[PDB]
Design a binder for these strands. Structure first.
Lengths: 72, 70, 242, 95, 96, 172
RNA sequence: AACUAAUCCUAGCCCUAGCCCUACAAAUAUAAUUAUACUAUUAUAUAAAUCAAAACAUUUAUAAAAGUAUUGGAGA
RNA sequence: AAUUAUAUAACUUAUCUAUUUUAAGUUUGAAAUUUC
């Protein structure tokens, strides 16, 4: 199933075989599938980072375009 | 008498009628923002000695009211 | 870069797309609508225009609500709009005196009230103002149902409202068990608040609860492709027969 | 109930804006607080007998907590709603 | 195997994999194929193709005869549960 | 990493890794006895590392339990523990546990409890003795080592005699 | 015509514009990345100060009307 | 030190509680200001 990790990302969680149910398994409950409040800052950075990535590739493309103009 | 044992180590939505509160049972893991489910008895399907517990003495067929001193 | 829509519009965009759009309209309206709580610690201006004494000119007026802090404990009780006013005080109420940090606490109490709809006596944190409102509302059950969420100012009260609305809506026999004649009287007494069962279910539900409920409502076990193809084959064969 | 008013006049925001509060605008004056006052009077009906405040069945005006903490808490007094008030007089009429 | 209390190893026969080796006698397929043999265009099998090849003929015959009902979906090959089969499609209970 | 060491489930007379579990509720009915007066034997007067006074092992019936030793407690002595409130003066052997009602005024006592059932908490140090200043009906006055005179119900248990090391309070 | 050296042009970036976003297996929060039980499972109070007032103390920003009326150790 | 010292703390009165016939004073001082 799709689950949210402690980093705020949504990732597919593959289920594991256990002899006891989840509620009787404290260790499985010990595993954290919830995001902490401080991840809100990270989420904004991810959106900004994605926007930054688009800018960087465009800058990278511009440098490659210089080669086209320079060669021809 | 002196008390032995440091004190440090010493030990709504549900009430609404006609509806059942949502719980993280579907999630299969605890989350603070969902209600704690009430779980019915679990059935392993086989006997595990490591987790098996001996039956009480009184329920034994050989239990006798008279005390036998050995 | 820069976000075309401000951060506050991010919430609106999320509500307009995904499971939030699929949420029931009645519940969506309840969340979207915001109603100002009845003033308690401040008096709104009676008139919208006044003559300034200095210039003798009519000027439009504005209302400044006093800041009031409502602790979560109020969400577990039934407060009649009273709240903790946190701020600074001047000793003896003269500006020439020292400033002291002050927390003003309305006197709070825990008392028991009987609910006819639920036929149970609930021990609740309540203030004297709420008791007057209950009498003005013509009953504790009436007060919970009549009072809006903001004026009620209690999650516990909202939970009672959902239960009362759900109880009234369903004509549930659980009301006053083994007294069918008495059950009808309670429904007739509070008949004004009868509403569709769907709406009553979502009254007072938290956002996390609402999203999970809608997710559960729309969750569907995967359809075995055998069944899907069997119906498709039969439909195609039946269509061919036509 | 506590009522407070800002000491410092806040510049008017006009027709459709919100004034921006400042540090001196954060200081408030206490016009009235029930805590400093003695308990205000409250109207209640004695459902039992209490010493030297009357007898069961009478309507007495007593200070809110003083009446509430002693009479109502023990159960001596009760609140008089409009519905039970009309019922009580009808019951008293039949009495 | 399982390590029980007292630090003693106890091998479990069931958990020990057994290599099922097929008989290659009479089998005409070898590691390599002729360059003389033309290659076949890849046609990955799908549920639609599998259902059409196996399940469709039975229903088509039954539909014309009229001996079709919803209750008998298992008759045409539906499995209500994977329990009872040594190899369960979901959840997978066998190794590669 | 701090775990309480006072976690022994079973009361024992053997030193515990050593700590010997002391009993400050003198009249605890031992096995195979009704809540009636019972007698015990002082097996040995041992040394307690965790207490200034020396502890004397007192055993009766099928139960053996450590207790504080009085001034004249010695090995082989017999110690009586009675719950009955004597109509007349009850025979007093130093170290015996008796209700304040049983004892007469002026008898030195130790290991007294402020409230019935509380257990001995004062006069547990070496050389400390409580004097029964006054006795009336069900109330008695006992002078604690702090010199604070307290009035308690006669149900409270008092052990006759002073604590061992009679000259501990006189140390210079 | 000498050794050490030197020579080069893009690697890429920067500012605005535009634009919100909705981009294998196996193992893992236990001791993370240890294929199955242990042990239940959980962040955060005005932001302050520095700083300015040449120190320091209330105090110190974070379309036009207009830097006007006002406020302020009436001073920054 | 001088001067104040509604941090708090106490008492008195309210307060809040029982019965039943923090604020305002004052005091300590968390401190503040000035001088040494």
């Amino acid at each position: 199933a799709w689950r949210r990790d402690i980093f705020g990302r949504i990732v597919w969680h593959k289920f594991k075989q256990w002899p006891i149910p989840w509620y009787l398994n404290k260790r499985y409950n010990r595993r954290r599938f919830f995001a902490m409040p401080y991840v809100d800052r990270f989420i904004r950075l991810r959106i900004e980072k994605h926007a930054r990535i688009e800018a960087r590739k465009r800058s990278l493309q511009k440098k490659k375009e210089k080669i086209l103009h320079a060669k021809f | 008498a002196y008390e032995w044992g440091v004190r440090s180590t010493r030990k709504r939505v549900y009430e609404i009628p006609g509806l059942e509160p949502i719980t993280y049972e579907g999630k299969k893991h605890f989350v603070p923002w969902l209600a704690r489910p009430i779980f019915p008895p679990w059935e392993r399907g086989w006997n595990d000695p490591r987790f098996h517990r001996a039956a009480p003495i009184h329920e034994q067929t050989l239990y006798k009211e008279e005390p036998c001193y050995i | 870069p820069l976000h075309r829509y401000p951060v506050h519009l991010w919430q609106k965009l999320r509500l307009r797309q995904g499971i939030c759009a699929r949420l029931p309209a009645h519940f969506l309206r309840s969340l979207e609508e915001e109603r100002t709580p009845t003033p308690v610690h401040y008096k709104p201006h009676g008139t919208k225009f006044k003559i300034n004494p200095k210039n003798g000119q009519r000027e439009r007026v504005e209302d400044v609500p006093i800041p009031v802090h409502y602790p979560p404990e109020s969400q577990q009780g039934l407060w009649g709009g009273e709240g903790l006013i946190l701020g600074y005080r001047y000793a003896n109420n003269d500006k020439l005196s020292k400033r002291v940090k002050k927390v003003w606490k309305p006197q709070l109490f825990t008392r028991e009230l009987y609910s006819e709809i639920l036929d149970k006596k609930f021990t609740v944190t309540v203030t004297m103002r709420t008791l007057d409102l209950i009498d003005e509302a013509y009953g504790f059950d009436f007060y919970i149902l009549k009072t809006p969420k903001e004026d009620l100012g209690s999650k516990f009260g909202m939970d009672l409202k959902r239960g009362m609305l759900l109880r009234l809506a369903r004509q549930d026999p659980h009301l006053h068990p083994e007294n069918p004649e008495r059950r009808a009287a309670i429904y007739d007494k509070y008949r004004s608040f009868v509403i569709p069962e769907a709406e009553a279910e979502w009254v007072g539900l938290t956002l996390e609860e609402a999203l999970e409920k809608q997710r559960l409502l729309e969750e569907k076990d995967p359809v075995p492709l055998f069944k899907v193809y069997v119906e498709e084959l039969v439909q195609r064969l039946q269509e061919q027969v036509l | 109930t506590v009522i407070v008013e800002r000491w410092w006049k806040v510049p008017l925001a006009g027709e459709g804006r919100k004034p921006h509060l400042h540090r001196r605008h954060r200081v408030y004056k206490l016009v009235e607080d029930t805590k400093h006052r003695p308990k205000d009077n409250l109207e209640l009906i004695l459902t039992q007998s209490v010493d030297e405040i009357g007898v069961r069945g009478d309507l007495v005006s007593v200070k809110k907590s003083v009446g509430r903490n002693k009479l109502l808490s023990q159960g001596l007094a009760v609140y008089a709603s409009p519905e039970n008030r009309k019922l009580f007089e009808e019951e008293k009429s039949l009495r | 195997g399982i390590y029980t209390s007292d630090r003693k190893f106890v091998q479990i026969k069931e958990m020990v994999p057994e290599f099922v080796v097929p008989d290659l006698t009479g089998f005409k397929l070898k590691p390599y194929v002729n360059y003389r043999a033309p290659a076949g265009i890849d046609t990955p099998l799908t549920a639609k193709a599998l259902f059409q090849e196996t399940v469709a003929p039975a229903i088509e015959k039954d539909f014309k005869e009229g001996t079709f009902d919803a209750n008998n979906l298992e008759k045409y090959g539906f499995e209500p549960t994977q329990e009872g089969k040594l190899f369960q499609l979901y959840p997978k209970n066998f190794p590669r | 990493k701090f775990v309480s060491w006072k976690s022994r489930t079973k009361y024992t007379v053997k030193p515990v890794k050593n700590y010997r579990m002391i009993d400050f509720l003198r009249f605890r009915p031992e096995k195979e006895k009704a809540p009636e007066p019972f007698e015990e034997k002082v097996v040995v007067v041992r040394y307690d590392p965790c207490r200034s006074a020396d502890i004397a092992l007192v055993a009766g019936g099928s139960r053996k339990r450590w207790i504080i030793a009085t001034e004249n407690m010695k090995a082989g002595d017999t110690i009586l523990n009675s719950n009955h409130i004597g109509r007349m003066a009850v025979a007093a052997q130093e170290g015996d546990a008796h209700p304040l009602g049983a004892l007469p005024v002026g008898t030195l006592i130790n290991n007294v409890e402020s409230e019935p059932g509380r257990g001995a908490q004062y006069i547990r140090a070496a050389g400390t003795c409580g004097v029964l200043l006054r006795k009336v009906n069900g109330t008695a006055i006992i002078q604690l080592p702090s010199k604070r005179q307290m009035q308690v119900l006669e149900s409270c248990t008092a052990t006759v005699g002073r604590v061992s090391n009679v000259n501990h309070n006189q140390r210079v």
